[PDB]
Structures are given as structure tokens and as C-alpha cells.
Short mmCIF file of C-alpha atoms in Angstrom, two decimals:
data_model
loop_
_atom_site.label_atom_id
_atom_site.label_comp_id
_atom_site.label_asym_id
_atom_site.label_seq_id
_atom_site.Cartn_x
_atom_site.Cartn_y
_atom_site.Cartn_z
CA UNK A 1 6.57 -41.14 -61.42
CA UNK A 2 5.29 -43.82 -63.79
CA UNK A 3 6.77 -44.36 -67.24
CA UNK A 4 3.54 -43.45 -69.08
CA UNK A 5 3.10 -40.26 -66.98
CA UNK A 6 6.75 -39.24 -66.50
CA UNK A 7 7.32 -36.02 -64.57
CA UNK A 8 9.32 -33.47 -66.57
CA UNK A 9 11.44 -31.32 -64.26
CA UNK A 10 12.98 -28.24 -65.86
CA UNK A 11 16.38 -27.01 -64.65
CA UNK A 12 17.21 -23.38 -65.49
CA UNK A 13 18.47 -20.13 -63.90
CA UNK A 14 21.13 -21.95 -61.87
CA UNK A 15 24.67 -23.29 -62.09
CA UNK A 16 24.99 -27.08 -62.27
CA UNK A 17 28.03 -28.71 -60.67
CA UNK A 18 28.13 -31.95 -62.67
CA UNK A 19 31.34 -33.03 -60.87
CA UNK A 20 29.47 -34.13 -57.72
CA UNK A 21 26.91 -36.15 -59.70
CA UNK A 22 29.59 -37.59 -62.01
CA UNK A 23 31.80 -38.68 -59.08
CA UNK A 24 28.95 -40.46 -57.29
CA UNK A 25 29.43 -44.20 -57.75
CA UNK A 26 25.88 -45.32 -56.88
CA UNK A 27 24.63 -44.66 -60.43
CA UNK A 28 25.06 -48.04 -62.12
CA UNK A 29 24.52 -46.58 -65.63
CA UNK A 30 25.81 -43.12 -66.60
CA UNK A 31 25.64 -43.04 -70.41
CA UNK A 32 25.59 -39.96 -72.64
CA UNK A 33 24.53 -39.98 -76.29
CA UNK A 34 25.05 -36.47 -77.68
CA UNK A 35 27.67 -34.72 -75.53
CA UNK A 36 30.84 -35.52 -73.61
CA UNK A 37 30.78 -36.20 -69.83
CA UNK A 38 34.23 -34.63 -69.37
CA UNK A 39 33.01 -31.41 -71.06
CA UNK A 40 29.74 -30.94 -69.11
CA UNK A 41 31.36 -28.49 -66.65
CA UNK A 42 32.43 -26.07 -69.42
CA UNK A 43 29.67 -26.11 -72.06
CA UNK A 44 26.53 -24.00 -71.65
CA UNK A 45 22.90 -24.85 -72.43
CA UNK A 46 19.64 -22.89 -72.41
CA UNK A 47 17.80 -25.31 -70.09
CA UNK A 48 17.77 -28.90 -68.84
CA UNK A 49 14.72 -31.18 -68.93
CA UNK A 50 14.68 -34.17 -66.56
CA UNK B 1 30.28 -58.54 -87.53
CA UNK B 2 33.71 -57.28 -88.61
CA UNK B 3 35.17 -56.13 -85.28
CA UNK B 4 38.83 -56.37 -86.36
CA UNK B 5 39.13 -52.60 -86.90
CA UNK B 6 39.32 -50.54 -83.70
CA UNK B 7 39.56 -46.84 -82.92
CA UNK B 8 40.77 -44.80 -79.94
CA UNK B 9 37.49 -43.61 -78.42
CA UNK B 10 38.95 -42.31 -75.14
CA UNK B 11 42.23 -40.50 -74.52
CA UNK B 12 43.46 -37.93 -72.02
CA UNK B 13 44.70 -35.48 -74.68
CA UNK B 14 44.43 -34.69 -78.37
CA UNK B 15 47.22 -35.93 -80.60
CA UNK B 16 49.95 -33.87 -82.22
CA UNK B 17 50.22 -34.02 -86.04
CA UNK B 18 51.80 -37.29 -87.27
CA UNK B 19 51.63 -38.95 -83.84
CA UNK B 20 50.64 -42.60 -83.39
CA UNK B 21 49.32 -44.08 -80.13
CA UNK B 22 49.93 -47.82 -79.75
CA UNK B 23 49.89 -48.18 -75.94
CA UNK B 24 47.09 -50.51 -74.79
CA UNK B 25 46.68 -48.99 -71.33
CA UNK B 26 43.47 -48.59 -69.35
CA UNK B 27 41.62 -45.26 -69.26
CA UNK B 28 40.36 -43.68 -66.04
CA UNK B 29 36.91 -42.21 -66.75
CA UNK B 30 36.23 -40.91 -63.24
CA UNK B 31 37.75 -39.76 -59.95
CA UNK B 32 38.05 -43.40 -58.84
CA UNK B 33 41.46 -44.83 -59.86
CA UNK B 34 41.52 -47.95 -62.02
CA UNK B 35 45.08 -49.24 -61.28
CA UNK B 36 45.27 -51.13 -64.57
CA UNK B 37 42.21 -53.31 -63.88
CA UNK B 38 38.81 -52.84 -65.52
CA UNK B 39 35.84 -51.84 -63.40
CA UNK B 40 33.36 -49.07 -62.63
CA UNK B 41 34.22 -45.85 -64.53
CA UNK B 42 37.13 -47.73 -66.16
CA UNK B 43 36.43 -47.99 -69.90
CA UNK B 44 38.88 -49.37 -72.45
CA UNK B 45 40.16 -46.68 -74.88
CA UNK B 46 39.82 -48.93 -77.94
CA UNK B 47 36.40 -50.01 -79.19
CA UNK B 48 35.40 -52.03 -82.24
CA UNK B 49 33.11 -50.99 -85.09
CA UNK B 50 29.94 -52.99 -85.61
#
């Protein structure tokens, strides 16, 4: 989508395997600002908005 | 910019009481090994305050 009309995709009612996404090397910028990347696979959250 | 003071942002384990870490070795942030050379998913443990 465009930046002024960004599509918000909601992730819920599923298990997220962040290991596969974190081990993919094609993402040139993988920066987190409020949590820890090494703790994503243990912590729990109500929902994810993309 | 006083960058002379640095802190250990990344480490593989929490420290025991009265334990000092002075080893300036590279940190492996992902599944890809670093082999002592900086690169993708290879971030230095020590960062400077701005």
C-alpha cells in the first residue's frame, strides 16, 4: 500500500514463529524499539498490528 | 557529544553479583556466525551514550 493509506493487517488467534523471520537475512533493517528480539519467542501479546 | 562512557548493551547471559566483563569480543545477534568480524546481525556489545 501507499504510505498515506497504509494497510493495517491484524495478527491474532495464531502462534507466531519469529525464529524463521528473524533468521531470514534478506531484511536489511530489523530494528526493535520497545521489546527484545531474543525474547519474542517467549513473551505473549494480545494482538499484532502490521 | 561525550561518547567516552560506554555500556554493555548486548551479552549472552546476565552477570553474577560483583562480576566485571572487560572482554571486547564480538556478539552474534543471529543464527549466522560472525567469526570475530563485524557484519550483518553482528552488533558490537559496547555502545556509547549520546
